[PDB]
CSV table of C-alpha atoms and ligand atoms in Angstrom, one decimal:
chain,number,residue,atom,x,y,z
A,1,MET,CA,24.5,-2.9,10.7
A,2,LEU,CA,21.3,-1.0,9.8
A,3,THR,CA,23.2,2.2,8.9
A,4,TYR,CA,20.0,4.0,7.8
A,5,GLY,CA,17.9,2.9,10.8
A,6,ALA,CA,14.8,0.7,11.2
A,7,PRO,CA,11.6,0.8,9.2
A,8,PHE,CA,9.3,3.7,10.0
A,9,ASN,CA,5.8,4.9,8.9
A,10,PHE,CA,6.1,7.0,5.8
A,11,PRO,CA,2.7,8.9,6.0
A,12,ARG,CA,3.4,10.0,9.5
A,13,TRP,CA,7.0,11.0,8.7
A,14,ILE,CA,5.5,13.2,5.9
A,15,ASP,CA,3.1,14.7,8.4
A,16,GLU,CA,5.8,15.6,10.9
A,17,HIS,CA,7.9,17.2,8.2
A,18,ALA,CA,5.0,19.1,6.5
A,19,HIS,CA,6.3,22.5,7.6
A,20,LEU,CA,9.6,21.8,6.0
A,21,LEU,CA,7.9,20.7,2.8
A,22,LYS,CA,6.2,24.1,2.6
A,23,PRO,CA,8.4,27.0,1.3
A,24,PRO,CA,11.0,28.2,1.7
A,25,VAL,CA,12.3,24.6,1.6
A,26,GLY,CA,10.2,22.2,-0.5
A,27,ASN,CA,12.8,19.4,-0.4
A,28,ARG,CA,13.5,17.0,2.4
A,29,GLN,CA,16.0,14.1,2.0
A,30,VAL,CA,15.0,10.9,4.0
A,31,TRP,CA,18.4,9.3,4.6
A,32,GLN,CA,21.8,10.9,4.6
A,33,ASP,CA,25.0,9.5,3.0
A,34,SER,CA,23.2,6.8,1.0
A,35,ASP,CA,23.6,5.7,-2.5
A,36,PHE,CA,19.8,6.0,-3.2
A,37,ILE,CA,18.8,9.7,-2.8
A,38,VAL,CA,15.3,9.5,-1.4
A,39,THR,CA,13.5,12.8,-1.1
A,40,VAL,CA,9.9,14.0,-0.4
A,41,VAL,CA,9.1,17.2,-2.5
A,42,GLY,CA,6.2,19.3,-1.4
A,43,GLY,CA,4.7,22.5,-2.7
A,44,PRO,CA,4.1,25.0,-3.8
A,45,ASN,CA,7.5,25.4,-5.6
A,46,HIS,CA,9.2,27.9,-8.0
A,47,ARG,CA,11.1,26.4,-10.9
A,48,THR,CA,11.9,27.8,-14.3
A,49,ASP,CA,15.0,25.6,-14.8
A,50,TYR,CA,15.2,22.3,-16.7
A,51,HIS,CA,17.2,19.6,-15.0
A,52,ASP,CA,19.4,17.4,-17.1
A,53,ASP,CA,20.0,14.4,-14.8
A,54,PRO,CA,22.7,11.9,-16.0
A,55,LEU,CA,20.8,9.1,-14.2
A,56,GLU,CA,17.2,7.9,-13.9
A,57,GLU,CA,14.6,9.6,-11.7
A,58,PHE,CA,11.7,7.7,-10.1
A,59,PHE,CA,8.6,9.6,-9.1
A,60,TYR,CA,5.6,8.6,-6.9
A,61,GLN,CA,3.2,11.4,-6.4
A,62,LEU,CA,2.0,10.4,-2.9
A,63,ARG,CA,-0.3,13.4,-2.2
A,64,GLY,CA,-1.8,16.2,-4.4
A,65,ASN,CA,-0.9,16.8,-8.0
A,66,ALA,CA,2.1,18.2,-9.9
A,67,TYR,CA,3.5,18.1,-13.4
A,68,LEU,CA,6.8,18.0,-15.2
A,69,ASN,CA,7.4,20.5,-18.0
A,70,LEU,CA,9.5,18.5,-20.5
A,71,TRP,CA,11.6,18.7,-23.7
A,72,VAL,CA,10.6,15.6,-25.6
A,73,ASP,CA,11.7,15.0,-29.2
A,74,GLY,CA,12.5,18.7,-29.6
A,75,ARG,CA,9.1,19.7,-28.4
A,76,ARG,CA,7.8,21.2,-25.1
A,77,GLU,CA,5.7,18.3,-23.7
A,78,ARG,CA,4.1,18.1,-20.3
A,79,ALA,CA,3.9,15.0,-18.1
A,80,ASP,CA,1.3,15.2,-15.3
A,81,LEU,CA,1.9,13.6,-11.9
A,82,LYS,CA,-1.6,13.2,-10.6
A,83,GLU,CA,-2.0,11.8,-7.1
A,84,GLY,CA,-1.1,8.1,-7.2
A,85,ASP,CA,1.0,8.2,-10.3
A,86,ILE,CA,4.5,6.7,-10.6
A,87,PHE,CA,6.9,7.5,-13.3
A,88,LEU,CA,10.5,6.7,-14.3
A,89,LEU,CA,12.4,9.4,-16.1
A,90,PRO,CA,15.1,8.2,-18.5
A,91,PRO,CA,18.6,9.8,-18.2
A,92,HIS,CA,19.1,13.3,-19.6
A,93,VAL,CA,15.4,14.1,-20.4
A,94,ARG,CA,15.1,17.8,-19.5
A,95,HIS,CA,12.5,18.4,-16.9
A,96,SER,CA,11.1,21.3,-14.9
A,97,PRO,CA,9.0,20.1,-11.9
A,98,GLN,CA,6.0,22.4,-11.2
A,99,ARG,CA,4.3,21.7,-7.8
A,100,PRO,CA,1.5,24.2,-7.4
A,101,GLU,CA,-0.4,22.5,-4.5
A,102,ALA,CA,0.4,23.2,-0.9
A,103,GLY,CA,0.4,20.0,1.1
A,104,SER,CA,1.4,17.8,-1.9
A,105,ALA,CA,4.0,15.2,-1.5
A,106,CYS,CA,6.0,13.4,-4.1
A,107,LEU,CA,8.5,10.6,-3.4
A,108,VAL,CA,11.5,11.2,-5.7
A,109,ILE,CA,14.4,8.7,-5.8
A,110,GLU,CA,17.7,9.1,-7.5
A,111,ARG,CA,21.3,7.9,-7.4
A,112,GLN,CA,24.5,9.5,-6.1
A,113,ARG,CA,26.4,10.6,-9.1
A,114,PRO,CA,29.9,9.2,-9.6
A,115,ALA,CA,32.8,11.6,-9.9
A,116,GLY,CA,32.8,13.1,-13.4
A,117,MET,CA,29.1,12.5,-14.0
A,118,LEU,CA,27.7,16.0,-14.1
A,119,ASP,CA,24.2,17.3,-13.7
A,120,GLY,CA,23.0,20.1,-16.0
A,121,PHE,CA,20.6,23.0,-15.2
A,122,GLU,CA,19.3,24.8,-18.3
A,123,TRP,CA,16.9,27.7,-19.1
A,124,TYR,CA,15.2,28.2,-22.4
A,125,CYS,CA,13.7,31.3,-24.1
A,126,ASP,CA,9.9,31.8,-24.1
A,127,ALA,CA,10.1,33.6,-27.4
A,128,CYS,CA,12.5,31.7,-29.7
A,129,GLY,CA,12.9,28.5,-27.8
A,130,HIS,CA,16.7,28.4,-27.9
A,131,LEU,CA,18.9,27.5,-25.0
A,132,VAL,CA,19.6,30.6,-22.9
A,133,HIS,CA,22.0,29.3,-20.3
A,134,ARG,CA,23.4,26.0,-19.0
A,135,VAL,CA,25.4,25.3,-15.8
A,136,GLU,CA,26.9,21.9,-15.3
A,137,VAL,CA,27.4,20.8,-11.8
A,138,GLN,CA,29.0,17.8,-9.9
A,139,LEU,CA,26.0,17.3,-7.7
A,140,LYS,CA,26.7,16.5,-4.1
A,141,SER,CA,23.6,18.1,-2.5
A,142,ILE,CA,20.2,17.4,-4.2
A,143,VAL,CA,18.8,19.9,-1.7
A,144,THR,CA,21.4,22.7,-1.2
A,145,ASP,CA,23.7,22.9,-4.3
A,146,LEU,CA,21.0,24.2,-6.7
A,147,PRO,CA,19.8,27.6,-5.2
A,148,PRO,CA,23.2,29.4,-5.7
A,149,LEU,CA,23.1,28.2,-9.4
A,150,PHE,CA,19.6,29.7,-9.6
A,151,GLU,CA,20.3,32.9,-7.7
A,152,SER,CA,23.2,33.6,-10.1
A,153,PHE,CA,21.1,33.1,-13.1
A,154,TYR,CA,18.4,35.4,-11.7
A,155,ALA,CA,21.1,38.0,-10.8
A,156,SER,CA,22.8,38.1,-14.2
A,157,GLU,CA,21.0,39.7,-17.2
A,158,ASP,CA,23.9,38.5,-19.4
A,159,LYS,CA,23.4,34.9,-18.4
A,160,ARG,CA,19.7,35.4,-19.1
A,161,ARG,CA,20.2,37.0,-22.5
A,162,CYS,CA,19.1,34.7,-25.3
A,163,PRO,CA,21.9,34.3,-27.8
A,164,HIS,CA,19.5,33.8,-30.7
A,165,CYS,CA,16.9,36.5,-30.3
A,166,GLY,CA,18.4,38.6,-27.5
A,167,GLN,CA,15.3,38.5,-25.3
A,168,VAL,CA,16.3,38.6,-21.6
A,169,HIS,CA,14.7,35.6,-19.7
A,170,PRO,CA,12.5,36.7,-16.8
A,171,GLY,CA,14.1,34.6,-14.0
B,1,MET,CA,12.2,10.2,-25.5
B,2,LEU,CA,10.1,8.7,-22.6
B,3,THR,CA,11.6,5.2,-23.0
B,4,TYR,CA,9.7,4.0,-19.9
B,5,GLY,CA,6.3,5.5,-20.9
B,6,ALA,CA,4.1,8.1,-19.3
B,7,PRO,CA,3.0,8.4,-15.7
B,8,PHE,CA,0.3,6.0,-14.6
B,9,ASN,CA,-1.7,5.3,-11.5
B,10,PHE,CA,0.1,2.9,-9.2
B,11,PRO,CA,-2.8,1.6,-7.0
B,12,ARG,CA,-4.7,0.6,-10.1
B,13,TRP,CA,-1.7,-1.0,-11.8
B,14,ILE,CA,-1.3,-3.0,-8.6
B,15,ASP,CA,-4.9,-4.0,-8.7
B,16,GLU,CA,-4.7,-5.2,-12.4
B,17,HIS,CA,-1.6,-7.3,-11.6
B,18,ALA,CA,-3.0,-8.8,-8.3
B,19,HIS,CA,-3.2,-12.3,-9.8
B,20,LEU,CA,0.4,-12.2,-10.8
B,21,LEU,CA,1.4,-11.0,-7.3
B,22,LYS,CA,-0.3,-14.1,-5.9
B,23,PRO,CA,1.7,-17.3,-6.2
B,24,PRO,CA,3.2,-19.0,-8.1
B,25,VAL,CA,4.8,-15.6,-9.0
B,26,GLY,CA,5.0,-13.0,-6.2
B,27,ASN,CA,7.3,-10.6,-8.1
B,28,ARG,CA,6.4,-8.2,-10.9
B,29,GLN,CA,8.9,-5.7,-12.3
B,30,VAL,CA,7.4,-2.4,-13.4
B,31,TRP,CA,9.7,-1.2,-16.2
B,32,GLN,CA,12.1,-3.3,-18.2
B,33,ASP,CA,15.7,-2.6,-19.2
B,34,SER,CA,16.0,0.3,-16.7
B,35,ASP,CA,18.8,1.1,-14.3
B,36,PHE,CA,16.4,1.3,-11.3
B,37,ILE,CA,14.8,-2.1,-10.8
B,38,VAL,CA,11.3,-1.3,-9.6
B,39,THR,CA,9.2,-4.2,-8.4
B,40,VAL,CA,6.0,-4.9,-6.6
B,41,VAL,CA,6.2,-8.0,-4.3
B,42,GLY,CA,3.0,-9.6,-3.1
B,43,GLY,CA,2.2,-12.6,-0.9
B,44,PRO,CA,2.2,-15.1,0.4
B,45,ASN,CA,5.8,-16.1,-0.4
B,46,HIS,CA,8.2,-18.9,0.4
B,47,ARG,CA,11.8,-17.9,1.3
B,48,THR,CA,14.4,-19.6,3.5
B,49,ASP,CA,17.3,-18.0,1.7
B,50,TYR,CA,19.2,-14.8,2.8
B,51,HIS,CA,20.0,-12.4,0.1
B,52,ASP,CA,23.4,-10.6,0.1
B,53,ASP,CA,22.8,-7.6,-2.2
B,54,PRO,CA,25.9,-5.7,-3.1
B,55,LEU,CA,23.8,-2.5,-3.4
B,56,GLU,CA,21.1,-0.8,-1.4
B,57,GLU,CA,17.5,-1.9,-1.3
B,58,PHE,CA,14.5,0.5,-0.8
B,59,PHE,CA,11.3,-0.8,0.6
B,60,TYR,CA,7.8,0.7,0.8
B,61,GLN,CA,5.2,-1.6,2.2
B,62,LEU,CA,2.2,-0.3,0.3
B,63,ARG,CA,-0.4,-2.9,1.4
B,64,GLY,CA,-0.5,-5.5,4.2
B,65,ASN,CA,2.4,-6.4,6.4
B,66,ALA,CA,5.6,-8.3,6.0
B,67,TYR,CA,8.9,-8.7,7.7
B,68,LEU,CA,12.6,-9.2,7.0
B,69,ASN,CA,14.6,-11.9,8.8
B,70,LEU,CA,18.0,-10.4,9.2
B,71,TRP,CA,21.6,-11.1,10.3
B,72,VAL,CA,22.6,-7.9,12.2
B,73,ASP,CA,25.9,-7.8,14.2
B,74,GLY,CA,26.1,-11.6,14.1
B,75,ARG,CA,22.6,-12.0,15.5
B,76,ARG,CA,19.3,-13.0,14.0
B,77,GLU,CA,17.3,-9.8,14.1
B,78,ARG,CA,13.9,-9.2,12.6
B,79,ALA,CA,12.8,-5.9,10.9
B,80,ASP,CA,9.0,-5.6,10.4
B,81,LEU,CA,7.5,-4.0,7.3
B,82,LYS,CA,4.1,-2.9,8.6
B,83,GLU,CA,1.8,-1.2,6.1
B,84,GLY,CA,3.1,2.3,5.4
B,85,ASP,CA,6.7,1.6,6.4
B,86,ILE,CA,9.6,2.5,4.3
B,87,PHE,CA,13.1,1.2,4.8
B,88,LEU,CA,16.6,1.5,3.2
B,89,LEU,CA,18.7,-1.6,3.5
B,90,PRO,CA,22.5,-1.0,3.4
B,91,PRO,CA,24.6,-3.0,1.0
B,92,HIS,CA,25.4,-6.7,2.1
B,93,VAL,CA,23.0,-7.0,5.1
B,94,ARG,CA,21.7,-10.5,4.8
B,95,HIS,CA,17.9,-10.5,4.6
B,96,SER,CA,15.1,-13.1,4.0
B,97,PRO,CA,11.8,-11.4,3.1
B,98,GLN,CA,8.7,-13.1,4.6
B,99,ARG,CA,5.4,-12.0,3.1
B,100,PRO,CA,2.7,-14.1,4.8
B,101,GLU,CA,-0.3,-12.0,3.7
B,102,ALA,CA,-2.2,-12.5,0.5
B,103,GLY,CA,-3.0,-9.2,-1.2
B,104,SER,CA,0.0,-7.4,0.3
B,105,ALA,CA,2.1,-5.2,-1.9
B,106,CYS,CA,5.6,-3.9,-1.3
B,107,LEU,CA,7.4,-1.4,-3.5
B,108,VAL,CA,11.0,-2.7,-3.8
B,109,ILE,CA,13.6,-0.6,-5.7
B,110,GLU,CA,17.1,-1.7,-6.5
B,111,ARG,CA,20.0,-1.0,-9.0
B,112,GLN,CA,21.2,-3.0,-12.0
B,113,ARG,CA,24.5,-4.6,-10.8
B,114,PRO,CA,27.6,-3.7,-12.8
B,115,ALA,CA,29.5,-6.6,-14.4
B,116,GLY,CA,31.5,-8.3,-11.6
B,117,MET,CA,29.3,-7.1,-8.8
B,118,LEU,CA,27.8,-10.4,-7.6
B,119,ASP,CA,24.7,-11.1,-5.5
B,120,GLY,CA,24.9,-13.8,-2.9
B,121,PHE,CA,22.2,-16.2,-1.7
B,122,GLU,CA,22.9,-18.0,1.5
B,123,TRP,CA,21.2,-20.5,3.9
B,124,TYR,CA,22.0,-20.9,7.5
B,125,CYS,CA,21.5,-23.9,9.9
B,126,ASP,CA,18.6,-23.8,12.4
B,127,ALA,CA,20.6,-25.8,14.9
B,128,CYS,CA,24.2,-24.4,15.0
B,129,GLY,CA,23.7,-21.2,13.1
B,130,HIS,CA,26.7,-21.7,10.7
B,131,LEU,CA,26.5,-21.0,7.0
B,132,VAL,CA,25.3,-24.0,5.1
B,133,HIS,CA,25.6,-22.9,1.5
B,134,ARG,CA,26.3,-19.8,-0.6
B,135,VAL,CA,25.8,-19.3,-4.3
B,136,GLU,CA,27.1,-16.1,-5.8
B,137,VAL,CA,25.4,-14.9,-8.9
B,138,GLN,CA,25.8,-12.1,-11.5
B,139,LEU,CA,22.1,-11.0,-11.3
B,140,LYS,CA,20.5,-10.1,-14.5
B,141,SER,CA,16.9,-11.1,-13.6
B,142,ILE,CA,15.6,-10.1,-10.2
B,143,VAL,CA,12.5,-12.1,-11.0
B,144,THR,CA,13.8,-15.3,-12.9
B,145,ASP,CA,17.4,-16.0,-12.1
B,146,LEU,CA,16.7,-17.0,-8.4
B,147,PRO,CA,14.4,-20.1,-8.6
B,148,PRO,CA,16.9,-22.4,-10.3
B,149,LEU,CA,19.4,-21.5,-7.5
B,150,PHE,CA,16.7,-22.3,-5.0
B,151,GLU,CA,15.6,-25.6,-6.7
B,152,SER,CA,19.1,-26.8,-6.8
B,153,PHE,CA,19.6,-26.2,-3.1
B,154,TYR,CA,16.4,-28.0,-2.3
B,155,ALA,CA,17.4,-30.9,-4.6
B,156,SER,CA,20.8,-31.4,-3.0
B,157,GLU,CA,21.2,-32.9,0.4
B,158,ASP,CA,24.9,-32.2,0.2
B,159,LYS,CA,24.5,-28.5,-0.5
B,160,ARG,CA,22.1,-28.6,2.5
B,161,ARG,CA,24.4,-30.4,4.8
B,162,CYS,CA,25.8,-28.1,7.6
B,163,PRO,CA,29.6,-28.3,7.6
B,164,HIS,CA,29.7,-27.6,11.3
B,165,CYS,CA,27.1,-29.9,12.9
B,166,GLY,CA,26.1,-32.0,9.9
B,167,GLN,CA,22.3,-31.3,10.2
B,168,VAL,CA,20.7,-31.3,6.8
B,169,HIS,CA,18.8,-28.1,6.2
B,170,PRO,CA,15.1,-28.6,5.5
B,171,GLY,CA,14.8,-26.6,2.3
C,1,FE2,FE1,15.0,33.4,-27.7
C,2,FE2,FE1,24.5,-26.4,12.0
């Protein structure tokens, strides 16, 4: 059986879910209970966290532009997702998606994580560059298991305190 | 490190590889040695086989139209991939992609199969509908491990002989 339904027009599906791509949401998963996690991510968004995904992440910037703040070879690189770009992120490259444009839409595709394969969410210090805080999480909900993580980092000056220079991250 | 390179424009990449989407190829994998197998499939193509994929298969018909001959609930259903459609095929639904249009382009995304997870390739009889032949294969090469399977079915009248009505499949 076609568990996930029949083919349907993607542009128009993105149109009909525009208002849920705008904040306060941003995310919208296409099919539920599937192995491939297929999401459309709009803008504008608020992210200061770096994601440490134990599996690959496919990107296709369908509308508008966005960029990924990265940690590549110990440096703070930036990878731009201009409209029409596709990209395959290798496992565990830290990345912080910035989506400044309202009405943008990026197809993001990932894999359900097997039990014991944890996602990481880290913040780094603007001053000294050291790791400020890391939460590891057995991700079940690419859309709803992240904000409590975030809220609790923003709510805790201690979690935000850099252990190398003491500067409290802004959150 | 960005093992799979930097973002790049997908439309133009499809343009530059047009002539390899035309026969005798049809397939073109985007990145090598990745967990997500990301391919562009053009047309026109020749398929009489049904694929039995042990994992899910994501489709995004970027250009032109195509369709999937299916076996749903014991019947021969057809799922159309019109330009702009996306689709998520559940594991093990038998499917036979028909791509009649030259210049069409479909984004197909799959997963590297773990050792011991086999793909199936089956043919069915036009007359009686029974299974004519099935080859199971530990797929390493979504692009190059299939044609010898096919050639050997086309070359063997015995493999093509229906075991229920004796009609020899056309191949
Ligand atoms: Fe610091
Ligand atoms: Fe038959």
